[PDB]
Design a protein around this ligand. Sequence first.
Ligand SMILES: CC(C)(COP(=O)(O)OP(=O)(O)OC[C@H]1O[C@@H](n2cnc3c(N)ncnc32)[C@H](O)[C@@H]1OP(=O)(O)O)[C@@H](O)C(=O)NCCC(=O)NCCNC(=O)CCC(=O)c1ccccc1C(=O)O
Ligand SMILES: CC(C)(COP(=O)(O)OP(=O)(O)OC[C@H]1O[C@@H](n2cnc3c(N)ncnc32)[C@H](O)[C@@H]1OP(=O)(O)O)[C@@H](O)C(=O)NCCC(=O)NCCNC(=O)CCC(=O)c1ccccc1C(=O)O
Ligand SMILES: Nc1ncnc2c1ncn2[C@@H]1O[C@H](COP(=O)(O)O)[C@@H](O)[C@H]1O
Ligand SMILES: Nc1ncnc2c1ncn2[C@@H]1O[C@H](COP(=O)(O)O)[C@@H](O)[C@H]1O
Ligand SMILES: [Ca+2]
Ligand SMILES: [Ca+2]
Ligand SMILES: [Mg+2]
Ligand SMILES: [Mg+2]
Ligand SMILES: [Mg+2]
Ligand SMILES: [Mg+2]
Ligand SMILES: [Mg+2]
Ligand SMILES: [Mg+2]
Ligand SMILES: [Mg+2]
Ligand SMILES: [Mg+2]
Ligand SMILES: [Mg+2]
Ligand SMILES: [Mg+2]
Ligand SMILES: [Mg+2]
Ligand SMILES: [Mg+2]
Ligand code: NA
Ligand code: NA
Ligand code: NA
Ligand code: NA
Ligand code: NA
Ligand code: NA
Ligand code: NA
Ligand code: NA
Ligand code: NA
Ligand code: NA
Ligand code: NA
Ligand code: NA
Ligand code: NA
Lengths: 484, 483
Amino acid sequence: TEQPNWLMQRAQLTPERIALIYEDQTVTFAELFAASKRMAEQLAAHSVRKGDTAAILLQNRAEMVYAVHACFLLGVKAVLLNTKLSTHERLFQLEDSGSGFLLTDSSFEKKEYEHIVQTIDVDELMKEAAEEIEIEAYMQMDATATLMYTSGTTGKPKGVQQTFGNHYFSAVSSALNLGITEQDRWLIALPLFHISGLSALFKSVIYGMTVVLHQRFSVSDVLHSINRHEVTMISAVQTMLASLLEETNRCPESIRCILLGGGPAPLPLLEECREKGFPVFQSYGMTETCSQIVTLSPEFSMEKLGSAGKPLFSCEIKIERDGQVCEPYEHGEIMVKGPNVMKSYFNRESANEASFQNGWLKTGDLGYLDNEGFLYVLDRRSDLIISGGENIYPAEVESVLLSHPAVAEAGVSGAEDKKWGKVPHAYLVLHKPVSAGELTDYCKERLAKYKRPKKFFVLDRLPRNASNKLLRNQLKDARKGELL
Amino acid sequence: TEQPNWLMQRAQLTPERIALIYEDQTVTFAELFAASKRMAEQLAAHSVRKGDTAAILLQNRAEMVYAVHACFLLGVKAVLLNTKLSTHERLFQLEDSGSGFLLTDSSFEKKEYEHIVQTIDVDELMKEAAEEIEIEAYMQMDATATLMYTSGTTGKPKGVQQTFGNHYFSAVSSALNLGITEQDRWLIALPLFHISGLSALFKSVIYGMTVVLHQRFSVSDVLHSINRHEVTMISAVQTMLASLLEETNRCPESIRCILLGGGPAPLPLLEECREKGFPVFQSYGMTETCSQIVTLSPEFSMEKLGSAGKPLFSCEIKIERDGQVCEPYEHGEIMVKGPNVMKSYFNRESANEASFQNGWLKTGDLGYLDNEGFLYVLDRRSDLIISGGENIYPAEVESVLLSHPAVAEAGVSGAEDKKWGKVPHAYLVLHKPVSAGELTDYCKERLAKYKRPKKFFVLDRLPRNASNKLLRNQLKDARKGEL
Ligand SMILES: CC(C)(COP(=O)(O)OP(=O)(O)OC[C@H]1O[C@@H](n2cnc3c(N)ncnc32)[C@H](O)[C@@H]1OP(=O)(O)O)[C@@H](O)C(=O)NCCC(=O)NCCNC(=O)CCC(=O)c1ccccc1C(=O)O
Ligand SMILES: CC(C)(COP(=O)(O)OP(=O)(O)OC[C@H]1O[C@@H](n2cnc3c(N)ncnc32)[C@H](O)[C@@H]1OP(=O)(O)O)[C@@H](O)C(=O)NCCC(=O)NCCNC(=O)CCC(=O)c1ccccc1C(=O)O
Ligand SMILES: Nc1ncnc2c1ncn2[C@@H]1O[C@H](COP(=O)(O)O)[C@@H](O)[C@H]1O
Ligand SMILES: Nc1ncnc2c1ncn2[C@@H]1O[C@H](COP(=O)(O)O)[C@@H](O)[C@H]1O
Ligand SMILES: [Ca+2]
Ligand SMILES: [Ca+2]
Ligand SMILES: [Mg+2]
Ligand SMILES: [Mg+2]
Ligand SMILES: [Mg+2]
Ligand SMILES: [Mg+2]
Ligand SMILES: [Mg+2]
Ligand SMILES: [Mg+2]
Ligand SMILES: [Mg+2]
Ligand SMILES: [Mg+2]
Ligand SMILES: [Mg+2]
Ligand SMILES: [Mg+2]
Ligand SMILES: [Mg+2]
Ligand SMILES: [Mg+2]
Ligand code: NA
Ligand code: NA
Ligand code: NA
Ligand code: NA
Ligand code: NA
Ligand code: NA
Ligand code: NA
Ligand code: NA
Ligand code: NA
Ligand code: NA
Ligand code: NA
Ligand code: NA
Ligand code: NA
């Protein structure tokens, strides 16, 4: 039911191995444990207690890694907050999560949250003297470690409860797939508040593996960093891979694995990677599976071009239509099972009842398996738009648009975008005139920037079925004029 | 609480990868699943059912690997029987384990067991037709998978219940320690009825890693096999490692890990290996921990010469004397904890209550930790003698000798042996005269060969304490040889 705290044990086993490279900082596992314990002590001095919930609002930096591990050492659930969210969106997640604290810095406006949580500046925190404490030396496998918000298919996002067990089994299953060696170093230049970034921190302490952390994604900085630090592994979404290939015709020699996730990739991009020797491992995974659950090796990437691969060891996938398992090549809903699959959504009784069926999690994605068991994900959802690896839920954007007094009806669907894959376009029935710039300013207060419509259209009515349900995939074809 | 059956999932993921190389013949993971399922179907025809217990009595053969997996596919607990045991010793284990079946072959005299269990000849079995069955597609993590007998400190061995989860976590913790890559291949020339050998079969399906299987250990054959099959990992006890160093000064280029376990190694052997480039990983582990739980990397093998190393990831160790915490360098009993530690001894209420203390397992070994947490095991037990990696329990050998009519008292202690490490010597007080030859003939029927006393001594009395309990460490003084 319990394991020794991974950072504590890692520091005991290999104290001088490098845990973290960030800018001009190198942090050993010993140093990482010491800094996380110290930050835990300082958090306890600000009244944080075992069983509490603390939200983290930070850009990628060493202090963010300290904060996550400090929470674990205190027995505190960590809520990772997307830094691009508006105040409005963050407030809901702070309240819904039951957070009592917000750990952030001066680059965010802490005063807007003071009425709901105690705000703590991590940089001021680390300057304070505090009494030493006895850390939580064990992680309970079934305890919720981290909460991440996703799947706002009805308008409001859901908090995914990711257990210590989930994170352990994710890391172990990935190691069994990719192999692990002492020379491996993993470069993370995508947000630590996504499980794409955060999972590398757990791989780091479980494997004893250096993570090279970047705050932002810059292709040239990433190429220099790979060279300087002999990076062997890197995670990416397809926009990042596309940017890498636009910069260089050759993959750095030390790279043995580019873990590609977070949405569909254009097939010409994957073919170019294979042609030019980029070792791309396409994968299928989500917040709810604590990162990858199906992954595709480069050796099959052209024979199975279009496939996400096979389930990781200990994990399972099946395709069902209305409760009937599908034959090979028959389309249906992707359902997943494994020790990396989340406990449940936080305080979403109805969603949990709907989403789980006899141990299996319904993903909401459509796909099929071929005759060898390889998964093919079909880009068919209209309740989800993926832009640069960021999920956008039409229901959330539509809810904001509908709240405007001039808007009578609202539909949002994804338009093709060469750089981002898909971007949201808005389709509106108006009571009164309103400009695109007016609505954009209105969305700016309520939506992260990547969620705001890139184009607006005005219609007399929206396409709906006999039950009055919006048919989002039919919005692009309706009679409309562009709204200026 | 459950995982897909490891062999079934591995065959789904990498069907054409080589699972097993035996007599230089190859079995893919697809072929291994097919053969294990076929054997499971044939066992079901013989009325083996989910929840039964089946004992396995086989030398290292491909069919033994099939039998273990077939048991899992049927939901049947597998009791691994030591093939060197006398019929007498095996009958105790068949009855104590609750086995309903014995899977063996014609190299053993199955007729001796048919009054306790239904005996099945694996070779005759594989020739039979059988209906298809629905296999157990899942392994329950806390269900007992295998039983192995050990720790006969009271005079009879105890069956260690090893769960599927125990074996999974052993394999995962070892991979995190050693690293894993697609090119790894592991050679097993150790008995599969010990966890030293058997654990490689679970590593094989969890990692997708070939096991090169030898029925016996001969240094020449092992060296040729390593080079023929590009073996990168090998398991050894110190007698095997010493034999290797006698036949070659150069470690084969492909070997990256020699996992050494099963008892103390002579320090000059460890020094010579590192001097000559043999990548020896000393380890401390036992049946009760489903193989290694502490291991020492070659980078520390000189600075920490004499150490067993540090605990594997997820595992813990502490040193306690009389229930009190021991500071670094203070001697005490080694206690271990982790997800690879056994469920319990089977039907040994008193031993389980004594051996487990607040989630920790008492090992019966003495040791200390240095100031960096490295474990030093102190060779001080007199209730256990290790001969070529085989555990021998003085209490068991003494019980056999005591049962002889001419023997009034018996004490057994370990004598130094250049080849085996320690061998048992017997110290006797006799009612009537009896020769060493007569006593050896009597022991042949009741003890595996390596347990039989290599020398016999006669005494008027044995060293005892106030409570009249034998003091085995004092036996060596003093006596005359019995011929
Ligand atoms: C793609 C990223 C890196 C782009 O950010 P960046 O700012 O560097 O882009 P630039 O080219 O420099 O231009 C900046 C302009 O572009 C706007 N912008 C930035 N991001 C977006 C966006 N997503 N959509 C639309 N616009 C965007 C900026 O506002 C700016 O605009 P201007 O002011 O100039 O007009 C960055 O977006 C990024 O990091 N994306 C990745 C997020 C992510 O990690 N998603 C994965 C989430 N899914 C999971 O975590 C589960 C699956 C998973 O675990 C995984 C995923 C990937 C890889 C591995 C795994 C795994 O299983 O381990
Ligand atoms: C040492 C071995 C290989 C010697 O056997 P072998 O038959 O090859 O010896 P020879 O010299 O060739 O034979 C001549 C005669 O020698 C007699 N004999 C054989 N063995 C012994 C013995 N142990 N003691 C005394 N005499 C012996 C025979 O009578 C033979 O006569 P013939 O009949 O041939 O004419 C062999 O004994 C061996 O394989 N030993 C190892 C057994 C073992 O696996 N022990 C480990 C048990 N412990 C564990 O499993 C837990 C720890 C663990 O898991 C581990 C252990 C080691 C490595 C790794 C791990 C791990 O953690 O994964
Ligand atoms: N290889 C892939 N192909 C297509 N879609 C993907 C792939 N990997 C992930 N996705 C999508 O990304 C989503 C992840 O959402 P989340 O992790 O909840 O932010 C999944 O539910 C899929 O819809
Ligand atoms: N590195 C080591 N040094 C000393 N003794 C060991 C070592 N590894 C294993 N052992 C012994 O082997 C025993 C395990 O035997 P078993 O119960 O048959 O697995 C332990 O209790 C120890 O006495
Ligand atoms: Ca599963
Ligand atoms: Ca094992
Ligand atoms: Mg995420
Ligand atoms: Mg950029
Ligand atoms: Mg309105
Ligand atoms: Mg109105
Ligand atoms: Mg073959
Ligand atoms: Mg089971
Ligand atoms: Mg013992
Ligand atoms: Mg031999
Ligand atoms: Mg355990
Ligand atoms: Mg158990
Ligand atoms: Mg009881
Ligand atoms: Mg007698
Ligand atoms: Na530092
Ligand atoms: Na606490
Ligand atoms: Na270079
Ligand atoms: Na078909
Ligand atoms: Na199809
Ligand atoms: Na669904
Ligand atoms: Na797209
Ligand atoms: Na119109
Ligand atoms: Na045989
Ligand atoms: Na199956
Ligand atoms: Na009992
Ligand atoms: Na007890
Ligand atoms: Na006695």
